Amino acid sequence: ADEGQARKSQLQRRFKEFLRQYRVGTDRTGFTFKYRDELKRHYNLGEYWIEVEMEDLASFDEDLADYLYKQPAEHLQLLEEAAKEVADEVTRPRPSGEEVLQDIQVMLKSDASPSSIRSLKSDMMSHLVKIPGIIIAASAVRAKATRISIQCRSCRNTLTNIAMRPGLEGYALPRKCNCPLDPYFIMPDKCKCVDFQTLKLQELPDAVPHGEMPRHM
């Protein structure tokens, strides 16, 4: 428990030294800081996303790019919280109209051989996978509360800044106000929202074992 945050404050510091130090190019020609420059050039345009590459992360610090393959959930958070502390010491002082620091959605690509939908055995639960396919559907974008704040009903006590977890998982509202049993409601005025879609991915046509209809995810 107390070693949890003490590990994190040592991972969120080694994920920050990766963006801040990784270079490319040789010594004869000349170098190029690959991710500071993209952070700056994407922030100043108003985009807020970098595209980290897994081979680079592996070649810089070999342990991190393994955690990221095994526990991607609780480590993408540290990565996206270091991308926000680096995009702060690079673009500041922001000129006039913006002075609140945005949030950086760290995507990530790779150059590794793809699996297939028929090779998703349950031992791959919560591991980065990489599958090809064909989009078959597309929902309409919706909202998804990220940082939500509630309020009691009778005594009007507030308990704010509550953070939702990402993905498709809800939240369990308390029942112990400290007032009737479940006195808590959501305050619609104070809840930050982000978009979210929901696609449908069909497996490539030349990989069906040819007795049936292709499966999808």
Binding site: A73, S122, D123, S126, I136, Q202, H210
Partner: protein, 611 residues
């Protein structure tokens, strides 16, 4: 003594008998030779480890031979013996391959052919919790869903994960109160430490004609766990082997009015029952005269018709599906269309090709494409395969071609020259594949084919459809005296030796072999040997009331070019089988002609082509 006065379930659960059984199984695993001095479970475990399969087969008969006591304990309380055998086979493998811990760290032993094959309607309450072997078709299968195996929650008030409870397939697991903050409440799972396992549910039902004699066919459920999932598809014939396990349901109790429980077979071994060296074939193909010797191997009973035997043999192996370099997508499928008066063994020609071929299907014309269907088991409105996608590489045997409906007719033609279907149905918009060769037989109008008119009249078929067929054989009848005895004697004798008081081995393995190990080539010495015929015959036909050999006949001829590359392994185009290709492509055209033209064109060409 390994048999004392308790319940077989509770004898084996005691520490003493447990350890005795544990050690007893190892000695059989390590030391068991089979009629040649081979430790079978030394090579078999190896062949399992060369593939990362975590599933070991134990034939029951040998277990009974080398072990008299376990093969009697087994089908009495198999929910624990099949657990002890797991830990035995583990410690054996981790000795024959000490690193295998990096592959799944868990072994399941299947069991092959218990001696008690059974029916699916004769399962009564006597068999609750007893190993069982059955049979029957499977008629559904859900998707491979993941199920909890070793769940582990986490408390909402203390950030501490509760105990790793195991999941039993009858009741949702129930965690107690947090031993760290006594915060009894609605815990949620912890997706990171929980272990999952594959899962699939199928609905098996009695075989069609086997036992369903004068009643309706019953059915049962089955649950395939981790390694077994996707061992069988709707339509397969399997034979389960699994504990017959019951569980309480609250709905049946509210319909039947009595306390009634549901039952399900926790499958333990699934073995399909369906249809799945050259040094002879070298000289057998080098006979140089394999044509005659193979023609009279198909159509084994039906006498005569060595004409249509030729065409159908050409069709069976096929041709060569070359891809034109100009993006024109020529097809490599031979489609046939029989026709003739009733009573001439057309349907038998269809049924025998059902057998001899492979991956074949069948249908009547009185279901052709994928359609929305409410699943028997899953109760979801899925999409099911039709009858032209189940021959995506083999053959499609159509019967009663005339009786097709307008939708069926407008759907059959699309797949001929495109071989690809789209389905924008209520389910979802897809575009699948269909590469099949069509073998159908129509009927003559007026109850008899009369060759005064063209064939395009007695067939009763839409005209751009007949063009989508390569061969057009016309069957008829004969009253010749000398053949009456020949056919009679044959039928009578075939009724003498069928009742309870090249063979079928060379050509099946041969359609398997010759399908694969040939890739016919195409030179350009025949490219001008044919045009000298076309320039003549086009005029010869257009002169009268007919349309000459057109490009869609040259395509069929050039397809049947390679039709003999599969029989001879020749694979090189020569001016020899071009004499055959042109001969056949005119054989299937002079018959579909007029009264005096079917003979005038004969007097010209049948004497011209130097048959």
């Amino acid at each position: 003594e390994d048999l004392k006065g308790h319940s077989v379930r509770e004898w084996v659960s005691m520490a003493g008998p447990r350890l005795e059984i544990h050690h007893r199984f190892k000695n059989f695993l390590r030391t068991h030779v089979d009629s040649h001095g081979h430790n079978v479970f030394k090579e078999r475990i190896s062949d399992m480890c060369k593939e990362n399969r975590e599933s070991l087969v134990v034939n029951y008969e040998d277990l009974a031979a080398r072990e008299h006591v376990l093969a009697y304990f087994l089908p009495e309380a198999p929910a624990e013996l099949l657990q002890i055998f797991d830990e035995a086979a583990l410690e054996v493998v981790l000795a024959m391959y000490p690193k295998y811990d990096r592959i799944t760290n868990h072994i399941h032993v299947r069991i092959s052919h218990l001696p008690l094959v059974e029916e699916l309607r004769s399962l009564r309450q006597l068999h609750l919790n007893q190993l069982i072997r059955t049979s029957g078709v499977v008629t559904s299968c859900t998707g491979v869903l993941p199920q909890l195996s070793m769940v582990k929650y986490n408390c909402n008030k203390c950030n501490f994960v509760l105990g790793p409870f195991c999941q039993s397939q009858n009741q949702e697991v129930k965690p107690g109160s947090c031993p760290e903050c006594q915060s009894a409440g609605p815990f949620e799972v912890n997706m990171e430490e929980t272990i999952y396992q594959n899962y699939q549910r199928i609905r098996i039902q009695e075989s069609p004609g086997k036992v369903a004699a004068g009643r309706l066919p019953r059915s049962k459920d089955a649950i395939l766990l981790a390694d077994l999932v996707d061992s069988c598809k709707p339509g397969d014939e399997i034979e389960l082997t699994g504990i017959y396990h019951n569980n309480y349901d609250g709905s049946l109790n509210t319909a039947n009015g009595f306390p009634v429980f549901a039952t399900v077979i926790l499958a333990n071994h699934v073995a399909k029952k369906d249809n799945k060296d050259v040094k002879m074939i070298t000289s057998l193909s080098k006979d140089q005269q394999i044509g005659e010797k193979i023609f009279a191997s198909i159509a084994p009973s039906i006498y005569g018709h060595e004409d249509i035997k030729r065409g159908l043999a050409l069709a069976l192996f096929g041709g060569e599906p070359k891809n034109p370099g100009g993006k024109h997508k020529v097809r490599g499928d031979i489609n046939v269309l029989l026709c003739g008066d009733p009573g001439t063994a057309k349907s038998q020609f269809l049924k025998y090709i059902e057998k001899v071929s492979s991956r074949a299907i069948f249908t009547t014309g009185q279901g052709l494409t994928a359609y929305v269907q409410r699943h028997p088991v899953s109760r979801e409105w899925t999409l099911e395969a039709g009858a032209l996608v189940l021959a995506d590489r083999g053959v499609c045997l159509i019967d009663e071609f005339d009786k097709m409906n307008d939708q069926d007719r407008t759907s059959i033609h699309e797949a001929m020259e495109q071989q690809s279907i789209s389905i924008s149905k209520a389910g979802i918009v897809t575009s699948l594949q269909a590469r099949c060769t069509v073998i159908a037989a129509a009927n003559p109008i007026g109850g008899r084919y009369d060759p005064s008119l063209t064939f395009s009249e007695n067939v009763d078929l839409t005209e751009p459809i007949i063009s989508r067929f390569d061969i057009l054989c016309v069957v008829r009848d004969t009253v010749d005296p000398v053949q009456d005895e020949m056919l009679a004697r044959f039928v009578v004798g075939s009724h003498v030796r069928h009742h309870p008081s090249l063979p079928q081995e060379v050509l099946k393995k041969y359609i398997i072999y010759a399908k694969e190990r040939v890739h016919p080539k195409l030179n350009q010495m025949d490219q001008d040997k044919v045009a000298k015929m076309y320039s003549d015959l086009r005029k010869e036909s257009m002169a009268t009331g007919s349309i000459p050999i057109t490009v869609r006949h040259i395509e069929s001829m050039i397809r049947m070019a390679e039709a003999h590359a599969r029989i001879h392994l020749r694979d090189y185009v020569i001016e020899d089988d071009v004499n055959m290709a042109i001969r056949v492509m005119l054989e299937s055209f002079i018959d579909t002609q007029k009264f005096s033209v079917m003979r005038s064109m004969r007097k010209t060409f049948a004497r011209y082509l130097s048959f």
